[PDB]
Amino acid sequence: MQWNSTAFHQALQDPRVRGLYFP
Amino acid sequence: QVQLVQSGAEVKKPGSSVKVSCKASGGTFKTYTLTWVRQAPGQGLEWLGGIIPIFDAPNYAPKLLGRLTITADESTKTSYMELSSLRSEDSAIYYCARVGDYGDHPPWGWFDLWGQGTLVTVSSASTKGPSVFPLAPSSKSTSGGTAALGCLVKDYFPEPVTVSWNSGALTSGVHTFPAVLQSSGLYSLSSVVTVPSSSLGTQTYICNVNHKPSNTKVDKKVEPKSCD
Amino acid sequence: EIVLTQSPATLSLSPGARASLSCRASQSVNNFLAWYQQKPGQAPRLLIYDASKRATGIPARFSGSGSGTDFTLTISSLEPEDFAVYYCQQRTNWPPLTFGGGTKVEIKRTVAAPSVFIFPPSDEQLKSGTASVVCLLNNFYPREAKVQWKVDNALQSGNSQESVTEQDSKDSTYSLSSTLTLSKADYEKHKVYACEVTHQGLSSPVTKSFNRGEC
């Protein structure tokens, strides 16, 4: 299925993944 | 200072596909830079999709999933929107828009710069020039007062048509109406002007109609109808 | 999907007046709401973002407020260039990102009655098997108007279409056409063609008419 905002922010719970958006 | 320039109008049959482009004139450009939105005639804005940064993941309106593809060529700073299996309700102006910074809330910022729009018409109709008919001033026009006259521009496809009066010299009193789509699938509009009743005998009033899609231009002089 | 509902659909306000536009979300969007302006023939333009931040280039008379589900765009004193359609949008929940349905802010001016004109079909058109009869309502305000076609005293329905101009830049009025379409066979079976117009500016409905084949 498509990604969605719930699943996306779940993925960003990982600090390294969140860090991709704040280098 | 970055500008977004979209490709030109498209006319498509149901079931076909369309690919619209949007080129940025400069600035930093990634595949995620440009999102697509559309607006059907007289309706509001509908998000089509965009690209999630870093993952470079296209994300689409659920109602178009499977039919819509957004891609981008970073080397040419161009985004492409391809919509297939077209339906009449896909008729709309399609806009590209730059997504701004997302702040602390990825993946989307706001739409801070827009292209000029691309008209896409989906219809079974075929190109056809208009017939132009006079809207003649009434024989009961108030003496020394104001008379209305016009041209009916009927049964053409696709949009647009332009109308001027007297080769552009006459703008006082002109109203050119938005076209209506008829159940036949062809468009029609009228253009009217109000003029001094006392001028109806000596001044010429000509509507200049141009339907570029069919290479049809007509100039019609409109005068009071003669009795028998 | 988060549905954004805008209220009212249309605001009629004079230049200089305060405008207050509402956008409500079906569930909370925190502060992740923006407002865009759109004029006929132009792309939208961002005004206010994340509920209350003003985009660069946007005048200080535009302010946004609200949080969660209830948001307001206030234009403290309307300028002529502010009469336009306004959309809200949220950037937090997807897919799809969603827009409200828009609120149009239009210019309130004094009531002006339409001048009405009727046009018979041309002989040239008749040769092709169809008759178009046109009724013009010129330079009126407000936009609401009722047009009724009568053919030999029979009220017509289903066979007319209306078109309306945008508000005139010079006088803030509207103009409107109503076009009655008949087959040639129906047209030639009847005599009296009339357009009857009702409007706030008229103390009695105006009827304009012609008799087919009479000068």
Coordinates of C-alpha atoms in Angstrom, one line a residue:
Chain A
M1 CA 0.0 0.0 0.0
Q2 CA 1.0 3.6 -0.3
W3 CA 2.9 5.2 2.5
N4 CA 0.8 7.5 4.7
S5 CA 1.3 10.1 7.4
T6 CA 0.7 7.6 10.3
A7 CA 3.2 5.1 9.0
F8 CA 5.7 7.8 8.0
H9 CA 5.8 9.4 11.5
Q10 CA 6.1 5.9 12.9
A11 CA 9.2 5.4 10.7
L12 CA 10.6 8.7 12.0
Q13 CA 10.5 7.3 15.6
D14 CA 13.9 5.9 14.7
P15 CA 16.3 8.8 15.5
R16 CA 18.6 8.0 12.6
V17 CA 15.6 8.1 10.2
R18 CA 14.3 11.3 11.7
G19 CA 17.9 12.7 11.3
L20 CA 17.6 12.3 7.5
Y21 CA 15.2 15.2 7.6
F22 CA 17.5 17.3 9.9
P23 CA 21.1 16.9 8.7
Chain B
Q1 CA 13.2 34.8 -8.7
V2 CA 12.7 31.1 -9.6
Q3 CA 9.8 30.8 -12.1
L4 CA 7.9 27.6 -13.0
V5 CA 6.8 27.2 -16.6
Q6 CA 4.3 24.5 -17.7
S7 CA 3.6 23.0 -21.1
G8 CA 0.7 24.0 -23.2
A9 CA -3.0 23.0 -23.3
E10 CA -4.0 19.4 -24.1
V11 CA -7.1 17.9 -25.6
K12 CA -7.6 14.2 -25.2
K13 CA -10.2 11.4 -25.8
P14 CA -11.5 9.3 -22.9
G15 CA -9.2 6.4 -22.2
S16 CA -6.1 8.1 -23.5
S17 CA -3.2 9.6 -21.4
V18 CA -1.6 13.0 -21.0
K19 CA 1.8 14.1 -19.8
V20 CA 2.2 17.7 -18.6
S21 CA 5.6 19.2 -17.7
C22 CA 6.8 22.0 -15.4
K23 CA 10.3 23.5 -15.7
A24 CA 11.9 25.6 -13.0
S25 CA 14.0 28.4 -14.3
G26 CA 16.7 28.0 -11.7
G27 CA 17.4 27.4 -8.0
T28 CA 18.1 24.2 -6.2
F29 CA 16.0 21.4 -7.8
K30 CA 15.3 17.8 -6.6
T31 CA 12.7 15.3 -7.7
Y32 CA 10.7 16.3 -4.6
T33 CA 10.7 20.0 -5.4
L34 CA 7.4 20.0 -7.4
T35 CA 3.9 18.8 -6.5
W36 CA 0.9 18.7 -8.7
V37 CA -2.7 20.0 -8.0
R38 CA -5.7 20.4 -10.3
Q39 CA -8.8 22.5 -10.5
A40 CA -11.9 21.4 -12.4
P41 CA -14.1 24.2 -14.0
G42 CA -15.7 26.3 -11.3
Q43 CA -14.4 23.9 -8.6
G44 CA -11.8 24.0 -5.8
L45 CA -8.3 22.7 -5.6
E46 CA -7.5 19.0 -5.6
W47 CA -4.1 17.6 -4.6
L48 CA -2.8 15.1 -7.1
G49 CA 0.5 14.1 -5.6
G50 CA 4.1 14.8 -4.8
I51 CA 7.4 13.2 -3.9
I52 CA 8.5 12.5 -0.4
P53 CA 12.1 13.8 0.2
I54 CA 15.0 11.5 0.9
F55 CA 13.0 8.3 0.2
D56 CA 12.1 9.9 -3.2
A57 CA 8.7 8.2 -2.9
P58 CA 5.8 9.4 -5.0
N59 CA 2.6 9.7 -3.0
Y60 CA -0.7 10.2 -4.8
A61 CA -4.4 11.0 -4.2
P62 CA -6.0 7.6 -3.5
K63 CA -8.7 8.2 -6.1
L64 CA -6.0 8.3 -8.8
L65 CA -3.6 5.7 -7.6
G66 CA -2.7 3.4 -10.4
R67 CA -3.4 6.0 -13.1
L68 CA -1.1 8.9 -12.1
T69 CA 2.7 9.0 -12.3
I70 CA 4.9 12.0 -11.1
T71 CA 8.5 12.0 -12.2
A72 CA 11.3 14.6 -12.3
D73 CA 14.5 15.1 -14.3
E74 CA 16.9 16.9 -12.0
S75 CA 19.3 17.5 -14.9
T76 CA 16.6 19.6 -16.7
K77 CA 14.8 20.9 -13.5
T78 CA 11.5 19.5 -15.0
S79 CA 8.7 17.6 -13.3
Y80 CA 6.2 15.5 -15.2
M81 CA 2.6 14.6 -14.4
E82 CA 1.3 11.7 -16.4
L83 CA -2.4 10.7 -16.1
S84 CA -3.8 7.7 -18.0
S85 CA -7.1 6.1 -18.7
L86 CA -8.5 9.6 -18.9
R87 CA -12.1 10.4 -18.0
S88 CA -14.3 13.5 -18.6
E89 CA -14.0 14.5 -15.0
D90 CA -10.2 14.8 -15.4
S91 CA -10.9 17.9 -17.4
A92 CA -9.2 20.6 -15.3
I93 CA -6.4 23.1 -15.1
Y94 CA -3.3 21.2 -13.8
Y95 CA -0.8 23.2 -11.7
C96 CA 2.7 22.5 -10.6
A97 CA 3.7 24.0 -7.3
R98 CA 7.0 24.2 -5.4
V99 CA 6.9 22.7 -1.9
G100 CA 8.7 24.9 0.6
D101 CA 10.6 23.9 3.8
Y102 CA 8.7 21.5 6.0
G103 CA 10.1 23.0 9.2
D104 CA 9.9 20.5 12.0
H105 CA 7.1 18.5 10.4
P106 CA 8.3 16.5 7.4
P107 CA 7.7 15.5 4.7
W108 CA 5.6 18.4 3.3
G109 CA 6.0 22.1 3.4
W110 CA 3.6 24.6 1.8
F111 CA 3.0 25.4 -1.9
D112 CA 4.9 28.7 -2.1
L113 CA 5.3 29.1 -5.8
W114 CA 3.1 28.0 -8.7
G115 CA 3.2 27.4 -12.4
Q116 CA 0.8 29.2 -14.7
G117 CA -1.4 26.1 -15.1
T118 CA -2.1 23.7 -18.1
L119 CA -5.6 23.2 -19.4
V120 CA -6.5 19.6 -20.1
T121 CA -9.8 18.8 -21.8
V122 CA -11.0 15.2 -21.9
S123 CA -13.9 14.7 -24.3
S124 CA -15.2 12.5 -27.1
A125 CA -15.8 15.6 -29.2
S126 CA -13.7 16.5 -32.2
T127 CA -12.3 19.9 -33.2
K128 CA -15.0 22.1 -34.7
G129 CA -15.2 25.8 -35.4
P130 CA -18.1 27.9 -34.2
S131 CA -21.1 29.2 -36.1
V132 CA -21.5 32.9 -35.4
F133 CA -25.0 34.5 -35.4
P134 CA -26.1 38.1 -34.8
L135 CA -27.9 39.2 -31.6
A136 CA -29.5 42.1 -33.4
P137 CA -30.6 45.4 -31.7
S138 CA -34.3 45.6 -31.0
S139 CA -36.5 47.7 -33.3
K140 CA -38.0 49.1 -30.0
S141 CA -34.6 50.4 -28.8
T142 CA -35.3 53.6 -26.9
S143 CA -35.0 56.6 -29.2
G144 CA -32.0 58.6 -28.1
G145 CA -31.2 55.9 -25.5
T146 CA -29.1 52.7 -25.4
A147 CA -29.3 49.6 -27.5
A148 CA -27.8 46.2 -26.9
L149 CA -26.4 44.0 -29.7
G150 CA -24.1 41.0 -29.8
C151 CA -22.8 37.8 -31.4
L152 CA -23.8 34.3 -30.5
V153 CA -20.7 32.0 -30.9
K154 CA -22.2 28.5 -31.0
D155 CA -21.1 24.9 -31.2
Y156 CA -17.3 24.9 -31.1
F157 CA -14.7 22.6 -29.6
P158 CA -12.4 22.8 -27.7
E159 CA -12.0 26.0 -25.8
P160 CA -11.0 28.8 -26.2
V161 CA -12.5 31.4 -28.4
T162 CA -11.7 35.1 -28.3
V163 CA -14.1 37.9 -29.2
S164 CA -13.3 41.6 -29.8
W165 CA -15.4 44.4 -31.2
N166 CA -14.3 46.7 -34.0
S167 CA -10.9 45.1 -34.2
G168 CA -10.2 45.9 -30.6
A169 CA -11.2 49.5 -30.8
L170 CA -14.5 49.1 -29.0
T171 CA -14.3 48.1 -25.3
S172 CA -16.9 50.5 -23.8
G173 CA -20.0 48.5 -22.9
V174 CA -18.6 45.0 -23.9
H175 CA -19.4 41.9 -22.0
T176 CA -18.1 38.5 -23.3
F177 CA -19.6 35.7 -21.3
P178 CA -17.9 32.6 -20.2
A179 CA -18.7 29.6 -22.4
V180 CA -21.2 27.0 -21.4
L181 CA -20.8 23.3 -22.3
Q182 CA -23.9 22.0 -24.0
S183 CA -25.2 18.4 -23.7
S184 CA -24.0 17.9 -27.3
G185 CA -20.5 18.2 -25.9
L186 CA -19.9 21.5 -27.8
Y187 CA -19.3 25.0 -26.2
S188 CA -21.2 28.2 -26.8
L189 CA -20.9 31.8 -25.6
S190 CA -22.2 35.2 -26.4
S191 CA -20.6 38.6 -26.5
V192 CA -22.7 41.7 -26.2
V193 CA -22.2 45.5 -26.2
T194 CA -24.4 48.5 -25.5
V195 CA -24.2 51.4 -27.9
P196 CA -26.2 54.6 -28.5
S197 CA -29.5 53.8 -30.3
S198 CA -28.9 56.8 -32.6
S199 CA -25.7 55.2 -33.9
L200 CA -27.3 52.1 -35.2
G201 CA -27.7 53.6 -38.7
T202 CA -24.2 54.9 -39.4
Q203 CA -21.5 53.2 -37.1
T204 CA -20.5 49.7 -37.9
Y205 CA -20.4 47.2 -35.0
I206 CA -18.4 44.0 -35.9
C207 CA -17.6 41.1 -33.6
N208 CA -14.2 39.6 -34.4
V209 CA -14.3 35.9 -33.4
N210 CA -11.2 33.7 -33.4
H211 CA -11.2 30.0 -32.6
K212 CA -7.5 29.1 -33.0
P213 CA -7.9 25.3 -32.5
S214 CA -9.9 25.0 -35.7
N215 CA -8.2 27.9 -37.5
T216 CA -11.6 29.7 -37.8
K217 CA -11.8 33.5 -37.8
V218 CA -15.1 35.3 -38.5
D219 CA -16.0 39.0 -38.5
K220 CA -19.7 39.6 -38.3
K221 CA -21.3 43.0 -38.7
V222 CA -24.4 43.2 -36.5
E223 CA -27.2 45.6 -37.5
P224 CA -31.0 46.0 -36.9
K225 CA -32.9 43.3 -38.7
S226 CA -34.7 44.5 -41.8
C227 CA -38.5 44.2 -42.0
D228 CA -39.5 41.8 -44.8
Chain C
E1 CA -8.5 11.9 5.2
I2 CA -9.0 15.2 7.0
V3 CA -11.9 17.2 5.6
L4 CA -11.7 21.0 5.7
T5 CA -14.9 22.9 5.6
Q6 CA -15.0 26.6 4.8
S7 CA -17.7 29.0 5.8
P8 CA -19.5 31.0 4.5
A9 CA -19.4 30.1 0.8
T10 CA -19.6 33.8 -0.2
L11 CA -19.0 37.0 1.8
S12 CA -20.3 40.3 0.4
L13 CA -18.4 43.2 1.9
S14 CA -17.5 46.7 1.1
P15 CA -14.0 47.9 0.5
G16 CA -12.6 48.9 3.8
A17 CA -14.6 46.4 5.8
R18 CA -13.3 43.6 8.0
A19 CA -13.5 40.0 6.5
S20 CA -13.6 36.9 8.7
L21 CA -13.3 33.6 7.0
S22 CA -13.7 30.2 8.7
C23 CA -12.0 26.9 8.1
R24 CA -12.8 23.9 10.2
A25 CA -11.1 20.5 10.1
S26 CA -12.8 17.2 10.8
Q27 CA -10.0 16.3 13.2
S28 CA -7.1 18.2 14.7
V29 CA -4.4 19.4 12.4
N30 CA -2.5 21.1 15.3
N31 CA -1.2 24.4 13.6
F32 CA -0.5 22.7 10.2
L33 CA -3.0 24.9 8.3
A34 CA -2.5 27.5 5.5
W35 CA -4.5 30.0 3.5
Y36 CA -4.3 30.8 -0.2
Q37 CA -5.8 33.5 -2.3
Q38 CA -6.9 32.9 -5.9
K39 CA -8.2 35.3 -8.5
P40 CA -9.9 34.3 -11.8
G41 CA -7.4 33.1 -14.4
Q42 CA -4.5 32.9 -11.9
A43 CA -2.8 30.3 -9.8
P44 CA -3.3 30.3 -6.0
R45 CA -0.9 32.3 -3.8
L46 CA 0.1 31.5 -0.3
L47 CA -0.9 34.1 2.3
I48 CA -0.7 32.6 5.8
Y49 CA 0.9 29.3 6.8
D50 CA 1.1 27.2 10.0
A51 CA -2.1 28.9 11.1
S52 CA -0.6 32.4 11.8
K53 CA 2.7 33.0 10.0
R54 CA 2.6 35.5 7.2
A55 CA 4.3 34.7 3.9
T56 CA 6.9 37.2 2.7
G57 CA 5.3 39.7 0.3
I58 CA 1.8 39.5 1.9
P59 CA 0.3 42.7 3.4
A60 CA -0.1 43.1 7.2
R61 CA -3.9 43.3 7.0
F62 CA -4.0 39.5 6.5
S63 CA -3.8 37.5 9.8
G64 CA -4.6 33.9 10.6
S65 CA -5.6 32.4 13.9
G66 CA -6.8 29.2 15.4
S67 CA -5.4 25.8 16.4
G68 CA -6.6 22.2 16.3
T69 CA -9.9 22.2 14.3
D70 CA -11.1 25.8 14.1
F71 CA -9.2 28.4 12.1
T72 CA -9.9 32.0 10.9
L73 CA -8.4 34.2 8.3
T74 CA -9.1 37.8 9.0
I75 CA -8.6 40.6 6.5
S76 CA -8.7 43.7 8.8
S77 CA -9.7 46.2 6.1
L78 CA -10.5 45.0 2.5
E79 CA -8.6 46.5 -0.4
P80 CA -10.0 46.1 -4.0
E81 CA -7.3 43.6 -4.8
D82 CA -8.5 41.4 -1.9
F83 CA -11.8 40.4 -3.5
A84 CA -11.0 36.8 -4.6
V85 CA -11.5 33.2 -3.5
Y86 CA -9.7 31.9 -0.4
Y87 CA -8.8 28.3 0.3
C88 CA -7.5 26.6 3.4
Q89 CA -5.2 23.6 3.2
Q90 CA -3.5 21.2 5.7
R91 CA 0.0 19.7 5.3
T92 CA 0.0 17.1 8.1
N93 CA -2.3 14.2 7.1
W94 CA -1.9 12.3 3.9
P95 CA -2.7 10.9 1.4
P96 CA -4.4 13.0 0.2
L97 CA -3.3 16.4 1.4
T98 CA -6.6 18.3 1.5
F99 CA -8.0 21.8 0.7
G100 CA -11.2 23.4 1.9
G101 CA -13.9 24.2 -0.7
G102 CA -13.2 27.9 -0.8
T103 CA -14.9 31.2 0.3
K104 CA -15.4 33.9 -2.3
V105 CA -15.2 37.5 -1.0
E106 CA -17.1 39.8 -3.4
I107 CA -17.7 43.5 -3.5
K108 CA -20.8 44.8 -1.8
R109 CA -22.2 47.9 -3.5
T110 CA -25.6 49.6 -3.8
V111 CA -28.4 47.6 -5.4
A112 CA -28.6 48.1 -9.2
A113 CA -31.4 46.8 -11.3
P114 CA -30.5 45.0 -14.6
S115 CA -31.3 46.4 -17.9
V116 CA -32.9 43.6 -19.9
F117 CA -32.8 42.8 -23.6
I118 CA -34.2 39.9 -25.6
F119 CA -32.8 38.6 -28.9
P120 CA -34.7 36.4 -31.4
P121 CA -32.8 33.7 -33.3
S122 CA -31.3 34.7 -36.6
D123 CA -32.8 33.5 -39.9
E124 CA -29.3 32.0 -40.6
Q125 CA -29.4 29.8 -37.5
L126 CA -33.0 28.7 -38.2
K127 CA -31.8 27.2 -41.6
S128 CA -29.7 24.7 -39.6
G129 CA -32.6 23.3 -37.5
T130 CA -32.1 25.1 -34.1
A131 CA -33.3 28.3 -32.6
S132 CA -31.4 30.1 -29.8
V133 CA -33.2 32.9 -28.0
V134 CA -31.0 35.1 -25.7
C135 CA -32.0 37.2 -22.7
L136 CA -29.4 39.7 -21.4
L137 CA -29.4 41.1 -17.9
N138 CA -26.9 44.0 -18.0
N139 CA -25.0 45.6 -15.1
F140 CA -26.8 44.6 -12.0
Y141 CA -26.1 44.0 -8.3
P142 CA -26.4 41.7 -6.3
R143 CA -25.7 38.7 -8.4
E144 CA -28.9 36.8 -7.5
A145 CA -31.5 37.1 -10.2
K146 CA -34.4 35.0 -11.5
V147 CA -34.9 34.5 -15.2
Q148 CA -38.0 32.7 -16.5
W149 CA -38.7 31.9 -20.1
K150 CA -42.3 31.8 -21.4
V151 CA -43.3 30.5 -24.9
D152 CA -47.0 31.2 -25.7
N153 CA -47.5 31.6 -21.9
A154 CA -45.9 28.2 -21.1
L155 CA -43.2 28.3 -18.4
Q156 CA -40.1 26.7 -19.8
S157 CA -37.7 24.5 -17.9
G158 CA -34.8 22.3 -18.7
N159 CA -34.0 24.0 -22.0
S160 CA -32.0 27.1 -20.9
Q161 CA -28.5 27.8 -19.7
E162 CA -27.2 30.8 -17.9
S163 CA -23.7 32.4 -18.0
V164 CA -22.5 35.2 -15.7
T165 CA -19.6 37.6 -15.9
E166 CA -17.1 38.2 -13.1
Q167 CA -17.7 41.4 -11.1
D168 CA -16.9 44.4 -13.2
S169 CA -13.7 46.2 -12.3
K170 CA -15.2 49.6 -13.0
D171 CA -18.7 49.4 -11.3
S172 CA -18.7 46.1 -9.4
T173 CA -21.8 44.9 -11.2
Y174 CA -22.6 41.6 -12.9
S175 CA -24.1 40.8 -16.3
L176 CA -25.9 37.6 -17.2
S177 CA -27.1 35.8 -20.3
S178 CA -29.9 33.2 -20.4
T179 CA -30.1 31.2 -23.6
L180 CA -33.2 29.2 -24.5
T181 CA -32.6 26.5 -27.1
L182 CA -35.4 25.0 -29.1
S183 CA -35.6 22.9 -32.2
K184 CA -36.7 24.7 -35.3
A185 CA -39.8 22.6 -35.4
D186 CA -40.8 23.7 -31.8
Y187 CA -39.8 27.3 -32.5
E188 CA -42.0 27.6 -35.6
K189 CA -45.1 26.2 -33.7
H190 CA -45.2 29.1 -31.3
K191 CA -45.6 32.9 -31.4
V192 CA -44.7 34.8 -28.2
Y193 CA -41.2 34.4 -26.7
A194 CA -40.7 36.2 -23.4
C195 CA -38.0 36.5 -20.8
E196 CA -39.2 37.6 -17.3
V197 CA -36.6 38.9 -14.9
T198 CA -37.0 39.3 -11.1
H199 CA -34.3 41.1 -9.1
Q200 CA -34.0 43.0 -5.9
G201 CA -33.5 46.3 -7.8
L202 CA -36.8 45.9 -9.7
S203 CA -40.1 47.0 -8.1
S204 CA -41.9 44.6 -10.5
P205 CA -40.6 41.8 -12.7
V206 CA -39.5 43.0 -16.1
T207 CA -40.7 41.1 -19.2
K208 CA -39.1 41.5 -22.6
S209 CA -40.7 39.7 -25.5
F210 CA -41.1 39.4 -29.2
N211 CA -43.6 37.8 -31.5
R212 CA -42.0 35.4 -34.0
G213 CA -42.1 36.9 -37.5
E214 CA -43.0 40.4 -36.4
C215 CA -40.7 43.4 -36.8

